[PDB]
Structure formats: structure tokens, C-alpha cells
Amino acid sequence: SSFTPLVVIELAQDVKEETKEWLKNRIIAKKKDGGAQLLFRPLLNKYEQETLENQNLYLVGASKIRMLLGAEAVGLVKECNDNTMRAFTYRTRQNFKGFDDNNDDFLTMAECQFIIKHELENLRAKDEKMIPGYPQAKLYPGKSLLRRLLTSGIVIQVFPLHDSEALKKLEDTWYTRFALKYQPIDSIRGYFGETIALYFGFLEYFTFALIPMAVIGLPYYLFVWEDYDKYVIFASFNLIWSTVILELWKRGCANMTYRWGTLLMKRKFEEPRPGFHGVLGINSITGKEEPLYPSYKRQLRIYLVSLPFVCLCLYFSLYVMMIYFDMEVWALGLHENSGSEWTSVLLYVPSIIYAIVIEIMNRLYRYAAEFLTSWENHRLESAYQNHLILKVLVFNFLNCFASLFYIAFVLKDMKLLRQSLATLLITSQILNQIMESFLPYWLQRKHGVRVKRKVQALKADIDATLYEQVILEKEMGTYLGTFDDYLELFLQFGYVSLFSCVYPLAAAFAVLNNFTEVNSDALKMCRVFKRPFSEPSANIGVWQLAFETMSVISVVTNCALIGMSPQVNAVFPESKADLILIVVAVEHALLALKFILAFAIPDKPRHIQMKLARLEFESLEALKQQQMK
Amino acid sequence: SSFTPLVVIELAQDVKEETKEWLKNRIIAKKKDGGAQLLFRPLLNKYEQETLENQNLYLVGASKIRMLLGAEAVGLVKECNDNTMRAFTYRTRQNFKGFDDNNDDFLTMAECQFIIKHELENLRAKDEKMIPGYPQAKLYPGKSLLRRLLTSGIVIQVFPLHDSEALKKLEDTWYTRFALKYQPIDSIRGYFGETIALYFGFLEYFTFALIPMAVIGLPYYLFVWEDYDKYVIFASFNLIWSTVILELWKRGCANMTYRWGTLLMKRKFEEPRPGFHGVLGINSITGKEEPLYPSYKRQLRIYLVSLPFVCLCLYFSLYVMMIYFDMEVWALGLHENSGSEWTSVLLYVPSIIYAIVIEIMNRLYRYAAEFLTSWENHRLESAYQNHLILKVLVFNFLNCFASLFYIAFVLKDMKLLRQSLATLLITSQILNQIMESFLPYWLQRKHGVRVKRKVQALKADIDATLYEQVILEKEMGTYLGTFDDYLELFLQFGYVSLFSCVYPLAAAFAVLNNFTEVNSDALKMCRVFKRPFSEPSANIGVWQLAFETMSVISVVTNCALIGMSPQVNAVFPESKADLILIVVAVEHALLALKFILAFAIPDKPRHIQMKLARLEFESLEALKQQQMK
Ligand SMILES: CCCCCCCCCCCO[C@@H]1O[C@H](CO)[C@@H](O[C@H]2O[C@H](CO)[C@@H](O)[C@H](O)[C@H]2O)[C@H](O)[C@H]1O
Ligand SMILES: CCCCCCCCCCCO[C@@H]1O[C@H](CO)[C@@H](O[C@H]2O[C@H](CO)[C@@H](O)[C@H](O)[C@H]2O)[C@H](O)[C@H]1O
Ligand SMILES: CCCCCCCCCCCO[C@@H]1O[C@H](CO)[C@@H](O[C@H]2O[C@H](CO)[C@@H](O)[C@H](O)[C@H]2O)[C@H](O)[C@H]1O
Ligand SMILES: CCCCCCCCCCCO[C@@H]1O[C@H](CO)[C@@H](O[C@H]2O[C@H](CO)[C@@H](O)[C@H](O)[C@H]2O)[C@H](O)[C@H]1O
Ligand SMILES: CCCCCCCCCCCO[C@@H]1O[C@H](CO)[C@@H](O[C@H]2O[C@H](CO)[C@@H](O)[C@H](O)[C@H]2O)[C@H](O)[C@H]1O
Ligand SMILES: CCCCCCCCCCCO[C@@H]1O[C@H](CO)[C@@H](O[C@H]2O[C@H](CO)[C@@H](O)[C@H](O)[C@H]2O)[C@H](O)[C@H]1O
Ligand SMILES: [Ca+2]
Ligand SMILES: [Ca+2]
Ligand SMILES: [Ca+2]
Ligand SMILES: [Ca+2]
Ligand SMILES: [Ca+2]
Ligand SMILES: [Ca+2]
């Protein structure tokens, strides 16, 4: 009753006492009795008439030997004394670096909350056919208790607790408000898990990978050096540099994910996602009882409902693009009509209105695609994430770059392309930084001041540092994965690299954004959202394919912008049939050299590959010594 | 002394008696005494004055429990009773299908010879600093005995024995001399290992994958249907069909290699190859003692000696191409000079001479590249094979298709392109089938008749069925891997798919070749060569990338041949700048649709993926039950 709280479970209001005692008896009971062996506590041992509306919050922690056995059960990969990353076991626990028998600093709070979430997830029902007290909670043997408690509306949320004394010491070394500074990815990892640290490492890498593009492209646009090289040197430098940074990110990510251990953590078998419903049956792979869904019904629900909706949304995005171009022609006629002083500022208004309409339509399509992909009854979470990423990537690519493609390849007017690209990039980045972190931080500050003034007017002997913290973090927003935060970088790379020939200055407009975003997203993790659960990840995932596809599409787009400028057309003034052949030959040579650069450089580095080969050879020698005895 | 001989070891002539008794004491001795526990025998217990020149051949076999323990040591994957492919262990040996305690039909002769070769390979020296009787044989602890006996010229060759009563029952169902017949890949596997069976399965697949190309392209060339579709339907059909067959081969190969078990055999750690010499030192990965070579010396020996030699050989191939074109112009002038009757046959002579010079220069470059890649001191065998495949593929692509590229894209004369492509393909295939299998089979028949007539004039009580067989198979040729046999199919796919627009009939010229090659290569494995050692292989390897690169290059080549025909140029007679743009757009759409087809179709099939997921889940449940106890 004096332990450290790690995970808060918030029950619903209308929850009977029998379900509460049954959940408390299924949490505290030992691992041999079908429980989880976690220390359980109410938020307050006593209650008064004021705090009766907060009577459902419960705290879950455990003891040290329980956390070490849970780390054995999860499969954490820690550093041994001989500079080797091996899986953690309780029988071989003395081989690991920084471990004592009396050390509470071995497993960090992020790993402890991950272990408690994994032990609450692996809390299955064996004998019970229903939840005691609730009729409709259909429980089959082999079904997780927490998933059915979350879907049926009994457990509202399970969230870990922020540590207000280790978050401040992270924030002191995170906000690079003064100048350039290397981001502390290891402390970000030790506080937030590995997925958030991999995102912040990718953002720190992508910031320091557009700096050669911005530095080369800043006098290339101001001093106009397009006369001397005629768009051949700079375009080749941009495309080769994009391939080089997208391969060296894979090398640095292999180095980082070996340094944390998640390169060696095995692939855990995935449970059906919360919201996959079928008929009860025998799972073919595992042999246990699971919901089953026929695959032809899922393929019909995709290829007859989702794909026509995606095509309708792409057509509606093109229709809004045509409305914007009619508005642009109307504003140009109004500039031709009225005057000179107020009719130059009037040309920047419809692109700003179009950027706001783009950032509204993207969120509306995001809600529609989340509903339409949660409707197709996807089994795993990886397949649901892949389908959602495909839908959102296709519509966001079309809706963001359709007007720029229509300016560049139909109107062929580079001045309007420069103006529209700069206005779209700057307005979308500013509205992204306002709606993403700053306005939710202001609303969170207002809510925190209100919760503080409510807690200070109390009539009980409450230790305020814990109850006040749990009440404040109950009403915070949850983190919905690192999907929008990679999508913003994908659209930044799209605005930079697709039209870097006709407008390299936009690359600088990414770097001056990222110098804020490294701060801003950090604030979004620190004072805006709840603490996310730690998730091990070995790579960025499917985003590597998306960034490489962007870098491949930008080859064709950059060469088509080379073959339309007045600089290259002065070389071939009369014969426009050899210009297309030379531009297509340069484009195919750049694609071949890009694929040769992506295939030649190895993905893992040299010493990481040697360490994985040593880790394989030690297991092979263990197998040989088991065979020999 | 009455066992079945499986592996023949041929010693050299000048070998002292002490080395023979030391090798015999290191073979027969048990596994705990540092030996191999194999039954060893001389070829003949007695010798007369006639057979004294064949006194170095020795036979190696073993007993049944020894072969089962060696199958446990190797890691064979056999079928359990519950339709599951698990690794073979002697303690769990009763779970497997078709196994008795008194059954000599469980492990086939190919698997037994592979196990005996693996036990002779894993015969290491511990105490001895040199081979007893030979001073220069430098032996370090951790060095294989058979490798040092092979490199120092004491053991001449180690080869398995043909089974003359199971080869006939394979040959009865292999030679499809009558008509079309499905090739027995499982019996080919059970006799020849998995690599030869994967090659013959790929040849059987590639024969039945050019039949739609030949059947569609036979009236497309005779009835000239190029007027109606204008090269758009047929080219798209060819490129989509090449992508579809190169993905369905990966699906069928996953199915076959799961059906044999080599999809689940673990990657064995590779010893340094026979001919990698450096300085003696500590291996960083394994920790034992190995030869070490500095990587910068190897990179210098590649990028300063090998690459200039490859560039010089490509320049010499272009110079021989220019000599052939001067000869072609001279023969055309001679046809203009002399007459009509004998001056039409004279146009086919210089292309035949060029095909013979191509097939001579390819073998000369193959010898030069084998010497130049065995000179760079490559450590593993996979790296040596990859470098040799790169050199031979680049030179053979250039030397075979340089004249056709010069006709198609410089001269732009489709009649000479049809004549030269048909003559090069037919003459190269005929000379390939003559020099590959038929002439070595005739020489082997002559040598076998001579060896038979020598053995029948004997003066001893020799059981002739074994000694005669070992003497005949001593002087046969060895199989140098499945590299030339995939290279022939690569060049066939190059001659078919690069110029399938202007000459689809050549696709038929592949199928009428393969209907012989399925027979001919089979004869090359049956009555020409020694029995190859069984090698497990899960795929064709790097040849998938080579066939996909050929299918990608053929998109650009087919579209460049579309944009030069008189059929497509009649659509755009005046504006030749929109024709190039439309052809390049069709080419990029075909490349995008080809990559979408290669990414959309999964590599492994559905049920193979379910079986691998079940095999992973059973091991995860075993780990969980080990953790719970
Ligand atoms: C151009 C983009 C610029 C982006 C800048 C982003 C960063 C701005 C804010 C930096 C300081 O961040 C600030 O840190 C302090 C702690 O030191 C936080 O304070 C909070 O925690 C402390 C410590 O428990 C409490 O005493 C305090 O009452 C509470 O409000 C505050 O809520 C946060 O706002
Ligand atoms: C992946 C395929 C890549 C292809 C890349 C090239 C594609 C387009 C090539 C042809 C367009 O190239 C060129 O474009 C311009 C418009 O910008 C056309 O017209 C313009 O030419 C110049 C441009 O300063 C002006 O002097 C002229 O008055 C105007 O008509 C021109 O007739 C065409 O020749
Ligand atoms: C892997 C294979 C790689 C290469 C494949 C592609 C090779 C394409 C080679 C094309 C060479 O063919 C080349 O075509 C251009 C038109 O485009 C010709 O150009 C000529 O005709 C065009 C059309 O009437 C005129 O506009 C132009 O002023 C004139 O020079 C040129 O004389 C010829 O030499
Ligand atoms: C278009 C291309 C056509 C390719 C045709 C390829 C096949 C042609 C030969 C087919 C028959 O193959 C033939 O089989 C017999 C066995 O039955 C072989 O005979 C050999 O083994 C048998 C059995 O131990 C011995 O009795 C015999 O003395 C020995 O020569 C012979 O060497 C081989 O040549
Ligand atoms: C990846 C890039 C792919 C590009 C594909 C297209 C490349 C070449 C395009 C231009 C060549 O297209 C065309 O070729 C022929 C030669 O075959 C040229 O010349 C010929 O045209 C026709 C061909 O029956 C004849 O009537 C004429 O007398 C002759 O000069 C023509 O001027 C050019 O217009
Ligand atoms: C991801 C991006 C995908 C698309 C990228 C490539 C887009 C290229 C679009 C090019 C359209 O530009 C198009 O160029 C051709 C020349 O090539 C022009 O053609 C015109 O000029 C040329 C040159 O003087 C004349 O030969 C021809 O008879 C005339 O019609 C045409 O009027 C214009 O409309
Ligand atoms: Ca932002
Ligand atoms: Ca962000
Ligand atoms: Ca790579
Ligand atoms: Ca042949
Ligand atoms: Ca062959
Ligand atoms: Ca695939």
C-alpha cells in the first residue's frame, strides 16, 4: 500500500461491485492461480462528498522480482558484461551490466510500464463464460480480459503515469531554443520507449539531411546559377543526395536499434485487433479458439466499397482544385481591374484559402478513412495500419500536389509555381504547427490551471502530488501513434524534393520548420499528451518505402521540369525531339544510378553485422554442445 | 568389410605409408577420440601386378546409427507424423514418417553421401602442427583436415558413387523423348540433391512459361497483326507475362523447397574457401584461429586490376563486333558482285562465324574471370560466386547483345535485325547443345568402352561391379555447379524478351530448344558427369535479380523498338515530339505496373505461410512452457 504507482486503470461509472472484486481478485492473484501477481490499490483509501465523481481510478504497480520475471516473460534485450546484447532471464541475471540485487535503477519506468501493460494484456479467461455481473460480455477460453473490458465499456482507459521529476531533467536537455544541438535520443528512449525515440532520431536526421540541399540551393536560386550548369549538376546532386540520406538513415537506424536491443527482440505473435469481429471458431495457425472472418467478404468490402470512396474523394479533391483555379483567375482579373497597391497582396489570398481548405479536407478524409478501414474487419493491427497508410498517403499526395502538378505540367508558368509552392508550404507548415501542438498546449495549460484551482479547494487530508497528478492526466489527450508525425515529414520531403529544380529555396523552408518542430513535437510529448506506452520498434516500417517512392517520383518530376525551362530549351532551339530523348536518357541514368546506390550500400553497418554474426555463432555453438553431450 | 560404399577418396601416387595410416586412424576412430567414426576400406584387399597403378582409391561408408547421428548433426528437416516439417534428432526419431528401427530406406543415398561429406569436412586438427610425413602442410588448430589434404595435393578427389540400379529407374521416367510430360522433380531430388532438382524445376517452369509467348507470337509474326494493335497490346502482354512468371516461380519455389525441407534448414556458418590465404590470426566473429586478409588490399585488387581487365574485355568485344560488321558489309558487297543463287546463302555465313567467335570468347573470358576472381582472395564462397556472376553476366550480356543493339538502335534495319537475331540464337543454342552434353557424352561412351575392354582383360578374382564402377567414375568429369546451366537460360530469356516486339518467333526458338535441353542436361547428369554432392538450396539465389533486371531492361528496349517501327510512326507522321512522349509515358506506366505486380503478389503462398506461422508458434509455446516451469 506504499508502492510506486505505474499504471492507472480508470473504470466506468456504472460498474457493479462484483465486477470490481472479480477484477481485483484476477489482478492480485499469483501466476499459478491464473492471475497476474500485480500490486493493486485504489487511488484514495477514503472518500468525501466532493471527490465521489472520481471513485473509479485505480493504481497498478508491482515488486522488483515481479518486474524481473515480467522482463523475462516479455523478452527485453539488455547489455551483458562482455559488451553483448542478450535476452534477459532471471536465472542468468548477474551477467548484465549495471545490475545489483538491491538496485531499483536497472529497469526504467518506461520498461516497467511496458511490462505491466504486457501482463495486463496477457490476462486470459479460462473457466468464465461471461464477465461476472455483465450479461453481454461474451467470454471464450483464450480471450484477453482487458480487451473485452475495454470494448464493452467497463475499463475506460489504461494509461501509464508521467514522472514529474524525470521529465524536467529531460526537458532541460531537449529544448534547443538557443541554437543547434544534438538531440539526446538515449534519454528520449529511456523515458518514452523506442518508437518515439526512433521518430525523434529520424527527425533529427532529416533536419541534418536537408541542410546541404538548403545551403546549395540558396545561392543557386538567388544568384541564378542555372545558366552555367543548365539544371544538370543540381538535379543530379539532389537525387543522389536523397538516395544517400535514405540509405544512411537505414544504417543509423540499425546502429540505434542495436544500441537499444530492439533489433534483436523477436516478433511477438499478434492478437486480433480490438474491433475484429467474426464467428467463433478454431484458429488454423495457433489451434486455439478465435474469431474467424471469410477472406472473400473482406476483399469484397475493400474492392467494392473502400476503393470507390477513395476514387470519389480523389475526384472531389480535383474539383476543389478547379474551384481554386477559378478563384485564382478571378483574383487575377480583380488585380487587373482595381489598382496597384492592394492588388499585389490579393494574389496571395486564394493560395492561403486553398491551403486551409487542404488542411481541413485532409482531416475530414482522415476521419472517413479511419472509419472505413475499421469497418473492413482487419485481423491484425499491421494490416489495418498498412491499409490506412495507403489510403491516407494516396489522398494526401494527390490533394497536396495536384495544384502544383497542374501549374507545372498544364499551365507551364513557373512564376505562379514558385508563388503557389512557397505559399502552400509555408501556410501548411504554420497551420500544422498551430493545430498540432501550440493550441492544444494552450488548452492544456488552461485545463491544468482549472484542475489545480479545483484541487486546491479541497476538504480532505489528501496527498495532492499523486491524486492531483492522476486527475490531471485523466483528462489529457492520448497519443495516436507516430503516423501523423511521419506524414508531416513525408509531405515536407514531397514539397522539397518534387520541385527542387524550379524552386530550391523551399528546402530552406523545411529546415526553418524542423528547427521548430524538434522543439514543438517535444512539447507535444511533454506537456500536452499522456505518457504513451513504450513500444519496441526496429525501423520506421513502411515509411522507408514511402520515402523511397517519393525520391523515385521526384526524378521524373525534376526531369520534366528540366525539359520545360527556357534555359535547357536554348540548347535545342529547333529540334525539340532530341531534347526529350536526352532528358529521358538522363532520367533513366539517374534512376539506374539511384537503384545501384541503394543496392550497393549495405543496410546494416560493418560492426553491427559482425556483432549479429557473433550472436548467431554463439547460439550455433550452444546447439553443437547440446548435440555433443 | 561388407558394407555399402558411398564416398570414394582418391589419394595421390607419391603418398607415404605414415600419412595413410594417420588418415585411416583419424577416420575410423570415434567422435570422442577426435575422429569421424566412418567405416573405411581399401578398394581391393589384394593387388596384382596389373592393378598397381590404381592403389590409391579408398571407400568410405558407415552404419545406420552413425548416419542417423550424422543427420542430427547436419540438421535435415524431415516430415513428422502430423504433416509437419521438423528438424531430425535421434532422441525424437520415432515421430517421423516412414521410419522404422529396421528400415534402411529412410535416408536416401544422396542424403547419406551428403552426411559423409559433411563429416569428412568437419574433421579438424587439434594437436598436430603438421601432417605426419609432409613438412609443408601447415596445420593450425581449427583447420579442416580434408581441405589441407586437397590443397596440398595428397587427397586428389572426394566423390560420391553412382547407383547403377536407381539411376536406370530415374532415367526411365526422365527422358521425355515422346511428347510433353511433367518432369519428376521429387525423384530428381532424391537422387541428385536439391540444387540440381531446383534447376530442373526452374527449367521445367521456364519451358512452360514461354509457351504463351510462342503461341501468341507465332500468328503475330506470320499474319502480321502489328497493323491492328500497333505494338501496344503484345508488348504489354509480354512484359506483364514476364513479371507474372518471375513471381509465380518464387511461389512455386517456396512450395517445392518447403516440400523438401530446405526452406527451414538454418544457414550454416561458412568456412573460408579453398584458396583463401592470408596471415594467421584471431577471427573476430568466431574467436578461433583463421587466416585474415586486410579488406583494403582486396578492394585494391578488385578496383585496380579486375575492373580495368573487364573494361578491356568489353572494348575487345566491341572491336570484334566492328570486325563482324565490316565482314557483313564485305559479304553484302560480294552478294552485289557475283550472282543470285550462291549469294543469298552467303549472307548467313558471317553471323554464324560471329556466333562461333562469341561462344569461343565467352569461354576464354570465363577462364580469365575464374582466374582473376580466384586471385582476389575472397573469404567465403558466396562472395566469390557473386563476383564471378557479376563479371560473367556483364561480359556475356555485352558480347551477346552488342551486335543486336547496334543493328536496332544505330543502323535501324529490322530485316538484318531479324536475320541476325535468328541466326545468333539458333547457332548459339546448337553449339551450346553440342559442346555442353552431346560431344562429352560421345567421349564418355568411348572412354567407357575402353575402360570396359581394359577391365575384362584381367587376371584376378575381382568383383568387377564395384572396382569397374570406381575406375570408370574416377576419370569422369566433375560438375562445376549450376552456373552455366542458369546462364544459358538467362541468355535465352535475353534473346527472347529484349526484342520480342520486332521478332516474337524467337520465343518459339527457345521452346524448341528447351524440349531438347530438358532431355540433354538430364543426359549430362546421368551418363556424362560424376554424381554431384547434394547441396541444400532454398532458391535459385542471385539469378532472380538477374532475370528481373533482364525483364526491366527489356521494357526500355521493347519501347525503343516500338518507337522506331513504320507502324507507330504512321500515327504521328509530322510531330515526332509527341511520339517520344507517348512512348516514354507507356514505358514508365509499364515499369510502374511491373513493380506494382511484383510488390502486390506475395512471395510465399498462403498455406506455406500458415505452416511457417504454425512452426513459429509451436517454438514460441515451447519457450513459454520453458519459462513457466
Ligand atoms: C518556435 C517553437 C518554440 C517552441 C517552444 C516549446 C517549449 C516552450 C515551453 C518550455 C518550458 O516548458 C515548461 O516547463 C515547465 C517545467 O519546467 C512546465 O511546468 C509544469 O511543471 C512544473 C514541474 O512539475 C510545475 O512546477 C508547473 O506548475 C507546471 O506548469 C510548463 O508547463 C512547461 O510549459
Ligand atoms: C519523363 C519525360 C520527361 C520529358 C521532359 C520534357 C517534356 C517537354 C518537352 C517539350 C516542351 O519544351 C518546350 O516547352 C515550352 C513551354 O514550356 C514550349 O513553348 C515555349 O518555348 C519557349 C519557352 O521559353 C518560348 O520561347 C516559346 O515562345 C514558347 O512557345 C516549347 O514549344 C517546347 O518545345
Ligand atoms: C537499352 C536501350 C537504350 C537506348 C534506347 C533508345 C535509343 C534511341 C535512339 C534514337 C536515335 O534516333 C534519333 O531520333 C531523332 C528523333 O527523335 C532523330 O532526329 C531527327 O529527326 C527528328 C524528327 O524528324 C527531327 O525533329 C530532328 O531535328 C532530326 O535531327 C535523329 O536523327 C535520330 O538519330
Ligand atoms: C534432341 C535431344 C535428344 C537427347 C537424348 C538423350 C538421351 C539419349 C540416351 C538415352 C538412353 O540412355 C542410355 O541408358 C543406358 C541404360 O539404360 C546406358 O547404359 C549404361 O548403363 C547400363 C546399365 O548399367 C549398362 O548396361 C550399359 O552397358 C551402359 O552403357 C547408356 O549409356 C545411356 O546412353
Ligand atoms: C526510352 C526512350 C524510348 C524512345 C522511343 C523512340 C525513339 C526514336 C523516336 C524517333 C525515331 O522515329 C523515326 O525513326 C525513323 C527511323 O526508324 C526515322 O526515319 C524514317 O522514318 C520513316 C520510317 O519508316 C520513313 O518513312 C523515313 O523515310 C525515314 O527517314 C524518322 O525520322 C523518326 O521520326
Ligand atoms: C509525374 C509527372 C508525369 C508527367 C511528366 C511529363 C509531362 C510532359 C507534358 C508535356 C506537354 O507539353 C507538350 O510538349 C509537346 C512537345 O514535346 C508540344 O508539342 C508541340 O511542340 C512541338 C515542338 O515545337 C512540336 O513538335 C509539336 O508538333 C507541337 O504539337 C505540346 O504542345 C505540349 O503540350
Ligand atoms: Ca508541424
Ligand atoms: Ca509533428
Ligand atoms: Ca542497400
Ligand atoms: Ca544448351
Ligand atoms: Ca544447360
Ligand atoms: Ca512479391
Author numbering:
A (entry chain B), B (entry chain A): 13 to 641
Sentences from the paper on this structure:
TMEM16K is a widely distributed, but relatively unstudied member of the TMEM16 family. Here we show that TMEM16K is an ER-resident lipid scramblase with non-specific ion channel activity and a dependence on calcium ions and short chain lipids for optimum activity. We present structures of TMEM16K solved by both X-ray crystallography and cryo-electron microscopy, revealing a classic scramblase fold, with extensive conformational changes propagated from the cytoplasmic to the ER face of the membrane, which lead to opening or closing of the lipid transporting groove. The TM domain of TMEM16K is C-terminal to the cytoplasmic domain and has ten TM α helices with TM3 to TM7 forming the lipid scramblase ‘groove’ and TM6 to TM8 forming the binding site for two Ca2+ ions, seen in other TMEM16s.
To understand whether TMEM16K can adopt alternative conformations and how changes in Ca2+ concentration affect the structure, we obtained three electron cryomicroscopy (cryo-EM) structures for TMEM16K in the presence of (i) 2 mM (‘high’) Ca2+, (ii) 430 nM (‘low’) Ca2+ and (iii) in the absence of Ca2+ (in 10 mM ethylene glycol-bis(β-aminoethyl ether)-N,N,N′,N′-tetraacetic acid (EGTA), ‘Ca2+-free’). These data sets had resolutions of 3.5, 4.2 and 5.1 Å respectively. The low and high Ca2+ structures are remarkably similar (mainchain r.m.s.d. of 0.42 Å); therefore below we describe the higher resolution 2 mM Ca2+ structure, unless otherwise stated. In the groove region, this conformation resembles the Ca2+-bound state of the mTMEM16A channel, and the recently published TMEM16F30, afTMEM1637 and nhTMEM1629 closed groove structures. The change from an open to a closed scramblase groove state is associated with extensive movements of the cytoplasmic domain and several transmembrane helices, leading to the ER end of the TM3−TM4 α-helical hairpin blocking the ER end of the groove. The closed scramblase groove has three distinct sections: a hydrophilic vestibule on the ER side of the membrane, a narrow neck and a cytoplasmic vestibule. The hydrophobic neck is lined with residues from TM4−7 (Tyr366, Ala367, Leu416, Ser415, Thr435, Leu436 and Tyr507), which together form a physical barrier to lipid movement. There is clear density for one complete lipid molecule in the 3.5 Å closed groove structure, lying adjacent to TM3, TM5 and TM9, in the cytoplasmic leaflet, a critical site for movement of the TM3−5 unit. The first unit rotates and moves up so that TM3−TM4 blocks the groove, while the second unit moves down, providing space for the first unit to rotate. These changes in TMEM16K conformation are not caused by changes in Ca2+ binding, as all three Ca2+-binding sites are occupied in both the 2 mM and 430 nM Ca2+ structures.
